[PDB]
A paper describes a structure:
Our analyses unambiguously identified three densities corresponding to tigecycline molecules; one on the mtSSU (‘mtSSU site’) and two on the mtLSU (mtLSU site-1 and site-2). Tigecycline density on the mtSSU was detected in two mitoribosomal classes, ‘P-site tRNA’ and ‘empty monosome’, but not in the class containing A-site tRNA. In the mtSSU, tigecycline interacts with helix 34 of the 12S rRNA through its polar edge and through ring A, which establish potential hydrogen bonds with the sugar-phosphate backbone of several nucleotides (A1258, U1259, U1325, A1326, G1327, and G1328) or make indirect contact via coordinated Mg2+ ions (G1328). Ring D stacks on top of nucleobase U1259, which further stacks on A1326, stabilizing the binding of tigecycline to the mtSSU A-site. In all our mitoribosome classes, we observed additional density in the region of mtLSU helices 69 and 71 (denoted as mtLSU site-1). To form a tigecycline binding site that consists primarily of a hydrophobic cavity between the base of U2628 and the nucleoside of A2604, helix 71 must undergo large conformational changes. However, comparisons with the translating ribosome suggest that binding to mtLSU site-1 could interfere with mitoribosome recycling and the translocation of tRNA from the A site to the P site. The third density corresponding to a tigecycline molecule was identified at the catalytic peptidyl transferase center (PTC). In this position, the ring A of tigecycline faces the lumen of the nascent polypeptide exit tunnel while the 9-t-butylglycylamido extension is in proximity of the terminal adenosine A76 of the P-site tRNA, potentially hindering the progression of the elongating nascent chain along the tunnel. Further studies are needed to confirm these findings. Together, the efficient binding of tigecycline in all three sites is likely to assure an efficient inhibition of several stages of translation.
Numbering used by the authors:
A (entry chain X): 87 to 245
B (entry chain D): 61 to 298
RNA sequence: UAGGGAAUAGUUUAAAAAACAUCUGACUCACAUUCAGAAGAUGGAGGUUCAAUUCCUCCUUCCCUAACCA
RNA sequence: UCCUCCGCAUAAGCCUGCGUCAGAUUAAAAAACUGACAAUUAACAGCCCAAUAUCUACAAUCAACCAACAAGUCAUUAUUACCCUCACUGUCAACCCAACACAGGCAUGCUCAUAAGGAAAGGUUAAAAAAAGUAAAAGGAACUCGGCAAAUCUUACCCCGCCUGUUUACCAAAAACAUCACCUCUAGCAUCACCAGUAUUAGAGGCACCGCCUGCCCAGUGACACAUGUUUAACGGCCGCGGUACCCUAACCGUGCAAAGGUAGCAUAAUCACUUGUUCCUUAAAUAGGGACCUGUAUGAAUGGCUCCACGAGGGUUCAGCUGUCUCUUACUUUUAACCAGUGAAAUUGACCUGCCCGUGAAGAGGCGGGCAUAACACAGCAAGACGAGAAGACCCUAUGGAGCUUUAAUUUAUUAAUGCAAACAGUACCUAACAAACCCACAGGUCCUAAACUACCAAACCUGCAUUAAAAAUUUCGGUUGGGGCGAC
RNA sequence: GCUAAACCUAGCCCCAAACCCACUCCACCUUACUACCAGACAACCUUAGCCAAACCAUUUACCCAAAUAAAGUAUAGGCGAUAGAAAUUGAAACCUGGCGCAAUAGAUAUAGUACCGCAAGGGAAAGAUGAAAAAUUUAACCAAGCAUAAUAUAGCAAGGACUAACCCCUAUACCUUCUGCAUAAUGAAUUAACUAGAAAUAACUUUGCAAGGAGAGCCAAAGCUAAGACCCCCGAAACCAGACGAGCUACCUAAGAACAGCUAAAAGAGCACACCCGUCUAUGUAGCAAAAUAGUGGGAAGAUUUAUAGGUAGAGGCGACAAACCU
């Protein structure tokens, strides 16, 4: 979203101008996820995926601010979780092939704890955090029956 | 704002359905077409424009009896209630269609053309060249969109290469596949264009609002323009 | 009242020609047409310019437009 | 005694807003004021339905007979599911929208005439002027811009518009707009307008029923075709200069110019140089009106021309009558008025102890000069002055002040459409010079001054980026001088 | 002597410091504040313009993360108006204070209430004894306006006077605006309160230090540091952005309602009520009324009139074009 001077002359009228990218619908296969995706892309994305030697490399290498898509960051979290877990759901019947994929991408492996939070928006993260912390309250009946026993137990040992 | 099209019913009936006026507004509530508004209330009678529509468990040519020919507020032509088997439907009446007639709905094309009786529906390939036809479709099974107004007809001009050339009421030629169905004869109410509105108020009865009083100076578009007939429109794919 | 334009053979148009009118002849019984000859004007006055049909300035003359707001 | 619009209900609105008691004191004068306490009770009304499929051509009008078009408000069945029974809310009033206890606005039913609902006069006097009425001698439009208003209850016509209709709420109702009719333009088609339509259609416009017509012009400008072009019921336009029958005029003559040279009609007026033309009607008298003629600075054909029925709160002319319009006013009634009592506004106002005449003066003095007049103060009238009041003149000019509108004003194409190109993506390629010199098989046949290189449309109606042309718009300005400005001139 | 007058609190202002705010039982996104049914609707997207440039058309400062300094320098710009860095440099922690207001001030605030507006929105006014009111009996005197107490030839209202108020003589209000105003040019009933000159450059004056000055930076060929001293108020028609508006009115949608009698009978026919409209006259003109009343009118089965709910929204709508109507 910008402006332009008509006929590239500052003394002419200043006009609003929007340059939009040329978008193509193409399909892409993920080795780690063993899935085909129909993604809207630019010609640039296709040039970047080539320079990365594939979609898995492109998603795994490119950082958040250069992917510029929540979908790319979900693909990353997805790929990263299979690598962190060595997930056997990838080609369940081909352990040899499955290990060739995971070795190919061994550079990007991170702990599963960290991979779960990769790409989450702040609002997603809080919901993830709120759900992890969602626990039913403990009835005070159980809490006091523990204090009583421990209170009776300590009294017995002393004498 | 909250405009909802009346054309919401999904099953064919012959019961006249209530329709809602638009006033020439679109769904935004804004005037889209000027000069529409008011008029007598009307009910819509669903016209079946697919003449060769065999019943659910039936197939092939079939006949129908004309039960009634009556007035239609929603179009300039007349409509005929026909009954065949266990089904009734509204169709466009032809010039001389009357109660008690029997009409033929056929999809058969033979080496020899049939004798074209008014009110019968045949594929274009089955008709003699020069027959007067109405209620034409552009693709086989699409349903009649052409030659539907009162007193109208087209002419079968040629039958070449499994296609039929016809002349539209506007005199422009139109090419379709020979399996397209048409009805023989002219649409009913042949004297419809001789009607005299008579007084301004009768145009209000028909749902027309008066023209703007604003004066417009005529521009280059005005004045007689003698241009050739457009080239034949083809709906055939090679 | 105030601005603009225009005055070319008798006529009407050109840029000093043309068609008429006129004059002379031929053709005709005669006339007309036609044919062949001939003459015929740059509004007047005032300039300049190497040279004034496009240029003056004025007069004389005819036209055109404008003459509005309270 | 008088009035009667009314009134009573429902709806909507409003929300305790003339019940009681106790207070104060009741109201544009003398409780609807304050505080307490009461109060409208459901049958009327509101608040409603288990599912899925399926059904539903035949108006209404006393619905019969007839006759219509603008073609219409009222309907199920099948099979499952289904024991449970009167909750909740409105219910008052002298009421609401109009700043008000406002002559306004306000839907339906019923009565209207009333069974219901109300009081025009605070008391007096009975001047002007003013308002609203009634009556009026003789005359009867002499009034006046006009018969406005009144009275009476008429005739004939002219213009314009055909007609009913529509409009500037709050200065214009009209001749303006629409309109039946006629014609021009665009469009071959569906699932949100047009339209559940389909060229006898549907959109954009002109003009204005009907009758008689609607002439000529495509050069220019626009549209369309963009191959010579087509198109006026598109924008528009539709000739001169000389001469010839006494004059007038020119059937006629000469020459020139244009795309065509204004045709048919019509013309002393919604139209008007002279002009109040001229003539015939009309009056005693006509710058009026009618009929004609003259003929058009600048009449004229769907920017419609010319007639004509009917119609009009349109503009104009008129017979008869009618009358206070007038000659020429008068009389009476009510209102207002004036006086008494109650209540009690507004604009306005430098201060005022606020005369006249002449003169003067920022050019029209109560106020200055010179004269003249002159105890003081209420009330009623009047409208000559106070350049009276009201609204920082709507005229006119000025302001490098606005704004609306229109364009061939300048700037621009963001947007929109079309087009090209590039991007994306089909998806496969050998297709235009034979000429027999003793050498040539009984045939599908060798050579000489000719036996060659040899991508097809870039690969769709999309989307992006670039240009290009349009349409629609947007932003901004509209110099000065000037014996006011404009115009002219500078 | 009335009406009045007077008051000192309520609170408020600017800083500092410190990082605030929940259910309170029941109700509340449907017509909010409404115990209790089959759904799926979902957020993001450059401000513009006034104004300055004495028009206007490119352009015209707007905290963006340390005071100072570099520097109004580099640079940008119808190279105009104006705009304008960076490198580099690197001062300071002690909340409870005030040469702030004191009822027309200070918050709009006693309250976002009353009141006004359909809505968005706009938006007030005011109190005052005393230790005790379970002491109601103790003070003056003060604006305009009045009252006590109208008035006596003559004149900007006074002045000079005078024994004497007046009589005599002299004397053309004021402000603004103008060549020039008693002007019959502007404004002003009057009282009270409120209500309008803000700062650089250079210079000057008065100190300090002085070839130096200055508490880094900046100036210096008597400079340099410091100080003093200086440039108003109210007013358009507009322009743009985002909201709110169709309970009026224009047009439309859904579904209603009304239209007596008489004539004629095909009905946008006639007469004529209810009803709708508004031709003409008079009245009224701060009205009864921010468009009415009386009479007279036009239409009144229709392109009629009208109740209800809904729709279209300002670069817009709507329009039988009147540039109509859109509270
Ligand atoms: C002053 N002249 C130019 C003139 C003026 C007017 N009218 C006006 O100027 C009106 N002006 C207003 C609009 C009122 C401001 C005019 O109205 C006229 C005329 C011209 C005459 C010429 C007449 C002439 N004859 C008959 C004396 C004549 O020969 C012709 C002719 N065409 O050749 C006429 O038509 C003539 O009769 C005529 O009509 C004239 C005007 O109408
Ligand atoms: K009228
Ligand atoms: K006349
Ligand atoms: K005459
Ligand atoms: K009329
Ligand atoms: K007077
Ligand atoms: K003068
Ligand atoms: K300006
Ligand atoms: K004066
Ligand atoms: K003056
Ligand atoms: K004045
Ligand atoms: Mg039309
Ligand atoms: Mg029109
Ligand atoms: Mg007279
Ligand atoms: Mg007279
Ligand atoms: Mg009258
Ligand atoms: Mg006309
Ligand atoms: Mg009006
Ligand atoms: Mg009206
Ligand atoms: Mg007005
Ligand atoms: Mg009127
Ligand atoms: Mg008209
Ligand atoms: Mg006609
Ligand atoms: Mg014509
Ligand atoms: Mg003629
Ligand atoms: Mg006449
Ligand atoms: Mg004239
Ligand atoms: Mg004339
Ligand atoms: Mg003309
Ligand atoms: Mg025309
Ligand atoms: Mg008629
Ligand atoms: Mg009428
Ligand atoms: Mg008349
Ligand atoms: Mg008479
Ligand atoms: Mg006067
Ligand atoms: Mg005055
Ligand atoms: Mg003024
Ligand atoms: Mg300006
Ligand atoms: Mg401006
Ligand atoms: Mg200029
Ligand atoms: Mg000037
Ligand atoms: Mg002048
Ligand atoms: Mg000029
Ligand atoms: Mg002056
Ligand atoms: Mg004065
Ligand atoms: Mg003045
Ligand atoms: Mg005054
Ligand atoms: Mg601007
Ligand atoms: Mg009538
Ligand atoms: Mg209307
Ligand atoms: Mg108009
Ligand atoms: Mg106008």
């Amino acid at each position: 979203l910008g402006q332009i001077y008509a006929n590239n002359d500052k003394l002419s009228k200043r006009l609003k101008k929007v340059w939009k990218p040329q978008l193509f619908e193409r399909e892409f296969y993920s080795e780690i996820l063993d899935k085909k995706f129909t993604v809207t892309v630019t010609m640039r994305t296709l040039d970047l995926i080539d320079e990365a030697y594939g979609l898995d490399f492109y998603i795994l290498k490119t950082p958040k601010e250069d992917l510029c898509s929540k979908f790319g960051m979900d693909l990353k979290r997805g790929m990263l979780l299979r690598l962190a877990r060595q997930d056997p759901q990838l080609h369940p019947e081909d352990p040899e092939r499955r290990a060739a994929i995971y070795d190919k991408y061994k550079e990007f492996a991170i702990p599963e704890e960290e991979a779960e939070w990769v790409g989450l928006t702040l609002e997603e993260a809080i919901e993830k955090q709120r759900l992890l912390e969602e626990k039913d309250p403990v009835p005070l009946f159980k809490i006091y029956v523990a204090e009583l026993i421990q209170q009776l137990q300590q009294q017995a040992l002393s004498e | 704002a909250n405009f909802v099209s009346w054309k919401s019913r999904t099953k064919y009936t012959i019961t006249p359905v209530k329709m809602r006026k638009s006033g020439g507004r679109d769904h935004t509530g804004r005037i889209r077409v000027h000069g529409i508004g008011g008029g007598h209330k009307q009910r819509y009678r669903m016209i079946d424009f697919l003449r060769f529509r065999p019943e659910e468990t039936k197939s092939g040519p079939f006949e129908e009896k004309v039960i009634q020919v009556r007035y239609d507020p929603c179009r300039s032509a007349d409509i005929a209630l026909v009954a065949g088997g266990s089904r009734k439907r509204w169709i466009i009446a032809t010039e001389n269609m009357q109660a008690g007639d029997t009409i033929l709905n056929s999809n058969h094309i033979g080496r020899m053309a049939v004798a074209a009786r008014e009110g019968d529906a045949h594929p274009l390939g089955a008709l003699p060249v020069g027959t007067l036809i109405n209620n034409v479709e552009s693709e086989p099974g699409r349903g009649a969109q052409y030659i539907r107004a009162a007193g109208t007809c087209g002419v079968l001009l040629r039958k070449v290469n499994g296609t039929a050339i016809i002349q539209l009421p506007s005199k422009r030629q139109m090419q379709v596949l020979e399996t397209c169905v048409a009805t023989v004869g002219r649409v009913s109410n042949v004297d419809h264009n001789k009607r005299v509105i008579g007084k301004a108020g009768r145009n209000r009865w028909l749902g027309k609002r008066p023209n703007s009083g604003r004066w417009h100076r005529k521009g280059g578009w005005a004045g007689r323009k003698i241009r050739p007939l457009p080239p034949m429109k083809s709906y055939v794919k090679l």
